[PDB]
Amino acid sequence: AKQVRWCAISDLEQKKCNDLVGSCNVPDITLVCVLRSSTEDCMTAIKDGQADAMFLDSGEVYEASKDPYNLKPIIAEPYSSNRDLQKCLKERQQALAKKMIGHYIPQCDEKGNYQPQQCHGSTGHCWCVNAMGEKISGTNTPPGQTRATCERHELPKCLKERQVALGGRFVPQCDEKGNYEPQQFHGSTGYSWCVNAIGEEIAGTKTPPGKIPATCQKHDLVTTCHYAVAMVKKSSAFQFNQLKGKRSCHSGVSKTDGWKALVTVLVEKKLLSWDGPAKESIQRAMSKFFSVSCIPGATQTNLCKQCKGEEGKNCKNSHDEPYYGNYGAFRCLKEDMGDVAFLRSTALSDEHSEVYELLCPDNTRKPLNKYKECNLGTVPAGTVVTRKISDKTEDINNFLMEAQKRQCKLFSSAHGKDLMFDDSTLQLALLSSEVDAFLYLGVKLFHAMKALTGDAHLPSKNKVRWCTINKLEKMKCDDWSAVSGGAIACTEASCPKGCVKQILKGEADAVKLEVQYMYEALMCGLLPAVEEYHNKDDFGPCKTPGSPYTDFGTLRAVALVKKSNKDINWNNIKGSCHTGVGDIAGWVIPVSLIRRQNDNSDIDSFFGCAPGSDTKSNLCKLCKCSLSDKEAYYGNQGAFRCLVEKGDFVPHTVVFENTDGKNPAVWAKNLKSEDFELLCAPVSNSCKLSGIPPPAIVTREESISDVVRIVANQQSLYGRKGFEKDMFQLFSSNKGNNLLFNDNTQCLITFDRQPKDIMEDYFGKPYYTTVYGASRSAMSSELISACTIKHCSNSLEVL
């Protein structure tokens, strides 16, 4: 028996909330409505633990994630992407979950695709549909009428471009499932360029051979986009560059559609004379820009004089102010209390097409139905937020999910529009607990919000902020900063992924990453400034960069078998054991190579000890089977214990250690380099699955030059064989082992960027093609999504 306290900012919001408390029965969750006078007071009440959840505009998210609020987005409306997999099955499940009779339930085939014809059973209407479930225009037919004959529209645009290129020289490379890869290489002419979601080239990305290709960003095609627009009456005659001195009405000071997009556009067009933040308030500059306005939540009295709320409620971020919100701003414009209204496109209807039109930032006027051509930018959906501590997220999610299933009236009310949520909300879905303001808004929008609130960091060109993942790293990096003479500074994160996030947020400058994190790091636009170099035998390239290198100290992944103690080859591996499921030398390389060949599900349908592999899968018992050396078959040493008992995939080094006597335990003491070999050959000969790229110190592109030079100078000072190495060592520490770099690192070598693909330019084509399929869509995550450019379209109808 739990309760969820929703915070209402107005009397109408409390009325709708009490309507829900009366009419919506959710088992084991009681809805309680706490009343405040404004958005900010509700944010504070949630921060104080007096309320649990509220709905915020996207423009309010960033300031919500900071003091004195410290709120986090938890529940948001999902958008339709061209990367949605198995969409028909999920839509059918969701429809079946709704406790109502007669609603449309999508009809799916045996494979999970949409049936080309979709029918609403209770009404008898039928229509046609493409591979994403979008209705073909005009194909809706009622009962008792000849139905539209429906074709399968399953072939993506890219694969069709392929097969209109191999019949009778541009052949485009595509991601698995027929999406365009963001980077295109012309195999004949050697040119490379970048493309958006539908494969049309973006301007200024084409590069000749030998030259360095442009950085290609991942794109996602998204449907139903809402926009920030300036709405005006057709009777007026002013244009956008004549906004100064006019009367205006806004949805809110903290909303994107009401304020932030407008200010960004005014700054870009140089219409708004204003310094930077912390020198002038944006609100003071806007108060000097407009004569008299209604901007709810504003603290300048002229930006509030046109507001219509009664005293104590005037200009508040609350529906108690009649001019608050998108519909409130439209009301102000209609009642001639302002000359222009700044609001979301969702408040536009064709009823207003007679009197109203849209003011475009290019100094033209257009009708309301041109809002996709006449806007101040896209406005992402609002979100339900709670405390960052996330104590009540489960209860809130359960309540909203059950209320949506039981058809409770969350997204409409007789009392008014946009009360507790946006009325345009179709559904609310749960977000990953990883999602914060940064992940929700995305890198670009996050930096825009950061700059707009005066938090933007201008990095130093002579100092490098190194990110640490634990307290020992922080201590060693503190020693390094104390001896660096202002060249090195220290930041703290929980894990390497947090360090990548901090670098993206402008809170840190560089971090060392192992291979696992490199895919995400390169997807988000980071680059390797330097790389760990482990060749103990040469040391040539360390003191002098470019004393050319023959071996980087890279580990080489192979499978270790016997000189005819056993009879194994690659073709009959079916029917050994592996170090771990997470290890890259082993598991990742062999599994990727196995299931890139064939097709299969190797999880059991291949071999006859791989710790972390469920329990007792057909292996995992030849060793219980935990991802630690507390079982004797974990790691390189335990995987070598796998090959001597129950004999039948490891780095090459694993033989050279323990062979010849170096590890004595009884089993590995009397073993020799002649008794064990590798399949592709003698144990030292290259008979390898693939080479593993070295760990990379990554940073932003603009910071590459500064990071490399500062690291080079510091390396000349400290580390292995340094002028003042007696003061500090880079690759060793009394605080711990392998802290900021692997202790066996010979040095750091500046990454030489080749005129190839950055993914191949780091991983190497064998590793890239084997592990990630040479595709930018091999893995998806919240971070990769936050670094993906959302591109809008009236529909996905490009099939």
Ligand X SMILES: NC(=O)OC[C@@H]1N=C(N)N2CCC(O)(O)[C@@]23N=C(N)N[C@@H]13
Please choose, out of 69-77, 149-157, 319-327, 749-757, the segment that lies near ligand X by the rule CB under 6 A.
749-757
Q: Least CB distance from residue 588 to ligand X, whole Å? A: 17
Binding ligand X by CB under 6 A: which of 362, 682, 753, 794?
A: 753
- At residue 8, φ and ψ (nearest 5 deg) are -100, 140
Q: Is 178 in the site for ligand X (CB under 6 A)?
A: no
Q: How many residues bind ligand X (CB under 6 A)?
A: 12
Query: What is the identity of the amino acid at 774?
Result: A
For the record, the structure tokens of 599 come out as 């097709």
For the record, the structure tokens of 245 come out as 């001195």
Whole-angstrom Cα distance, residue 648 to residue 640? 11
In this structure, the number of other CB atoms found within 10 A of the CB of residue 77 comes to: 19
Please choose, out of 144-152, 288-296, 624-632, 752-760, the segment that lies near ligand X by the rule CB under 6 A.
752-760
Please choose, out of 202-210, 284-292, 402-410, 745-753, the segment that lies near ligand X by the rule CB under 6 A.
745-753
Indicate the residue among 50 and 754 with the shorter CB distance to ligand X.
754
Site string for ligand X, 24-63 (x = CB under 6 A): ----------------------------------------
Q: Say if CB 221 and CB 793 are below 8 A apart.
A: yes
Please choose, out of 177-185, 197-205, 599-607, 747-755, the segment that lies near ligand X by the rule CB under 6 A.
747-755
Q: Say if CB 79 and CB 221 are below 8 A apart.
A: no
Please choose, out of 175-183, 356-364, 443-451, 759-767, the segment that lies near ligand X by the rule CB under 6 A.
759-767
Q: Say if CB 639 and CB 578 are below 8 A apart.
A: yes
Contacts of 573 (CB under 8 A, 6+ apart): 559, 594, 606, 607
Q: Least CB distance from residue 640 to ligand X, whole Å? A: 24
SS3 715: helix
Please choose, out of 19-27, 125-133, 504-512, 756-764, the segment that lies near ligand X by the rule CB under 6 A.
756-764
Q: Least CB distance from residue 744 to ligand X, whole Å? A: 15
Binding ligand X by CB under 6 A: which of 141, 302, 470, 554?
A: 554
Per DSSP, the residues of 142-208 read: -TTSPPPP-------HHHHHHHTSS-------B-TTSPBPSEEE-TTT--EEEB-TTSPBPTT--B-
Q: Least CB distance from residue 527 to ligand X, whole Å? A: 10
Indicate the residue among 546 and 661 with the shorter CB distance to ligand X.
546
For the record, the structure tokens of 220 come out as 């996602």
Region label for 525, one of left (φ > 0), alpha (ψ between -120 and 50) or beta (otherwise): left
Binding ligand X by CB under 6 A: which of 55, 330, 552, 676?
A: 552
Indicate the residue among 391 and 752 with the shorter CB distance to ligand X.
752
Indicate the residue among 509 and 761 with the shorter CB distance to ligand X.
761
Q: Least CB distance from residue 693 to ligand X, whole Å? A: 4
Q: Least CB distance from residue 707 to ligand X, whole Å? A: 16
Indicate the residue among 300 and 535 with the shorter CB distance to ligand X.
535
Q: Is 580 in the site for ligand X (CB under 6 A)?
A: no
What's the distance, CA 29 to chain centroid? 32
- At residue 128, φ and ψ (nearest 5 deg) are -105, 165
How does strand 429-430 pair with strand 71-76? antiparallel
How does strand 356-360 pair with strand 226-233? antiparallel
Q: Least CB distance from residue 765 to ligand X, whole Å? A: 8
Q: Least CB distance from residue 730 to ligand X, whole Å? A: 19
Indicate the residue among 410 and 530 with the shorter CB distance to ligand X.
530
3-state percent helix, strand, coil for the chain, nearest multiple of 5:
30, 15, 55
Whole-angstrom Cα distance, residue 758 to residue 54? 42
Please choose, out of 80-88, 144-152, 246-254, 758-766, the segment that lies near ligand X by the rule CB under 6 A.
758-766
Q: Least CB distance from residue 531 to ligand X, whole Å? A: 6
Strand partners, 201: 195
Binding ligand X by CB under 6 A: which of 377, 722, 764, 766?
A: 764
For the record, the structure tokens of 689 come out as 């699955």
Q: Least CB distance from residue 758 to ligand X, whole Å? A: 9
Strand partners, 180: 174
Whole-angstrom Cα distance, residue 356 to residue 348? 9
Q: Say if CB 158 and CB 199 are below 8 A apart.
A: yes
Q: Least CB distance from residue 756 to ligand X, whole Å? A: 7
Q: Say if CB 639 and CB 579 are below 8 A apart.
A: yes
Q: Is 754 in the site for ligand X (CB under 6 A)?
A: yes
Binding ligand X by CB under 6 A: which of 180, 330, 676, 751?
A: 751
Indicate the residue among 347 and 696 with the shorter CB distance to ligand X.
696
Interacting positions 641-700 with ligand X (CB under 6 A): 693-694
In this structure, the number of other CB atoms found within 10 A of the CB of residue 770 comes to: 19
Q: Least CB distance from residue 172 to ligand X, whole Å? A: 24
Q: Which residue in the shown chain puts its C-beta closest to ligand X?
A: 552
Q: Is 284 in the site for ligand X (CB under 6 A)?
A: no
Q: Least CB distance from residue 584 to ligand X, whole Å? A: 14
Q: Least CB distance from residue 548 to ligand X, whole Å? A: 10
Indicate the residue among 230 and 526 with the shorter CB distance to ligand X.
526
Closest CA to 67 of 88, 87, 47: 47
Indicate the residue among 243 and 707 with the shorter CB distance to ligand X.
707
Indicate the residue among 545 and 612 with the shorter CB distance to ligand X.
545
Q: Is 339 in the site for ligand X (CB under 6 A)?
A: no
Binding ligand X by CB under 6 A: which of 289, 718, 762, 768?
A: 762
Q: Which helix (H) or strand (E) is 30 found in, with range?
A: strand 29-35
Q: Say if CB 516 and CB 657 are below 8 A apart.
A: no
- Is it true that the peptide bond before 651 is cis, omega within 30 degrees of 0? no
Binding ligand X by CB under 6 A: which of 160, 752, 779, 794?
A: 752
Q: Least CB distance from residue 754 to ligand X, whole Å? A: 5
Indicate the residue among 230 and 697 with the shorter CB distance to ligand X.
697
Cα four-point dihedral sign 687, 689, 691, 692? negative
Interacting positions 478-537 with ligand X (CB under 6 A): 531
Beta sheet of 54-56, edge-to-edge order: 54-56, 383-387, 71-76, 429-430
Indicate the residue among 694 and 719 with the shorter CB distance to ligand X.
694
Q: Is 545 in the site for ligand X (CB under 6 A)?
A: no
Helix count and strand count (H, E) for the chain: 22, 30
Whole-angstrom Cα distance, residue 258 to residue 59? 9
Closest CA to 560 of 453, 654, 633, 660: 654
Instruction: Give residues in contact with ligand X (CB under 6 A).
Output: 531, 552, 554, 693-694, 751-754, 761-762, 764
